[PDB]
Each structure stands twice: as C-alpha cells, then as structure tokens.
Design an enzyme around this catalytic site. Structure first.
Site, PDB file in Angstrom:
ATOM      1  N   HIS A  61       0.186  -7.267  14.916  1.00  0.00           N
ATOM      2  CA  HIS A  61      -0.091  -6.125  14.047  1.00  0.00           C
ATOM      3  C   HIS A  61      -1.521  -5.733  14.256  1.00  0.00           C
ATOM      4  CE1 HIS A  61       3.556  -6.766  11.775  1.00  0.00           C
ATOM      5  NE2 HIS A  61       3.166  -8.017  11.475  1.00  0.00           N
TER       6      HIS A  61
ATOM      7  N   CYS B 167      -0.093   0.528  11.438  1.00  0.00           N
ATOM      8  CA  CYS B 167      -0.165  -0.464  12.517  1.00  0.00           C
ATOM      9  C   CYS B 167       0.254   0.214  13.801  1.00  0.00           C
ATOM     10  CB  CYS B 167       0.910  -1.528  12.208  1.00  0.00           C
ATOM     11  SG  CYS B 167       1.182  -2.715  13.533  1.00  0.00           S
TER      12      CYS B 167
ATOM     13  N   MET C 112       5.761   1.201   9.650  1.00  0.00           N
ATOM     14  CA  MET C 112       4.680   0.327   9.151  1.00  0.00           C
ATOM     15  C   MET C 112       3.420   1.177   8.944  1.00  0.00           C
ATOM     16  SD  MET C 112       3.490  -3.435  10.315  1.00  0.00           S
ATOM     17  CE  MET C 112       2.147  -4.172   9.414  1.00  0.00           C
TER      18      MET C 112
END
Ligand SMILES: [Cu+]
Length: 99
Positions: free
Chosen positions: A37, A84, A92
């Site tokens: 990430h 991310c 995300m």
C-alpha cells in the site's frame, strides 16, 4: 489519529476511510495487511492552496510490511481525498475533513 492500510480481513481499504481531524493533528497511516500500500493525496480533491506533493508518499514508494507508517499533519482546513496507488482502481480511497 491512526489510519490502517488494509483491513485485517484483506480488504483494500483505509480504516477509517473517512474521518475528521483538527488542523495540525498528526495522521499516522499505518501499514496493516494485504500490502503493498501507499498514501497519496489527490490534487483534484484537496482544499485550494494545498500542494499534495508535500503530504503524499512518492508514488513508487510502497509499504510492504506491517507496522511501517507514513505520517502527516494537515494544516489547511477543508476536505482532502487520499488514495493508495496500487489500489486506487479498487476503491482504496478515503476522505479527511480538517477542521
Ligand atoms: Cu493499497
């Protein structure tokens, strides 16, 4: 405030994905699970006047181990979208309201 990168169940999410913080509070993004990430802010979704390069990781830098952190304190009030890079297309992303 701490924000986890990846849910314990492997979900590609920031946890929490939306939250509010007073201006200047340090936000600690903490690598949690299902990495890699990282954390960047979206130049098209931050307050006017904010330069996202000062508050984002380098896009090529990835957190690959649990417990790594990326820490930032946001001073300008308003809404900020962070994401991310590997997982932006998988939803995300998140939003912090600095007040
Ligand atoms: Cu991710």
């Amino acid at each position: 405030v701490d924000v986890l990168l990846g849910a314990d169940d492997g979900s590609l999410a920031f946890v929490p994905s939306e939250f509010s913080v007073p201006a200047g509070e340090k936000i600690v993004f903490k690598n949690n699970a299902g990495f890699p990430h990282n954390v960047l802010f979206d130049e098209d979704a931050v307050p006017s006047g904010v330069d996202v390069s000062k508050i984002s990781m380098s896009e090529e830098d990835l957190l690959n181990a649990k417990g790594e952190t990326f820490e930032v304190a946001l001073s300008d009030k308003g809404e900020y979208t962070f994401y991310c890079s590997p997982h932006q297309g998988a939803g995300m992303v998140g939003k912090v309201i600095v007040n």
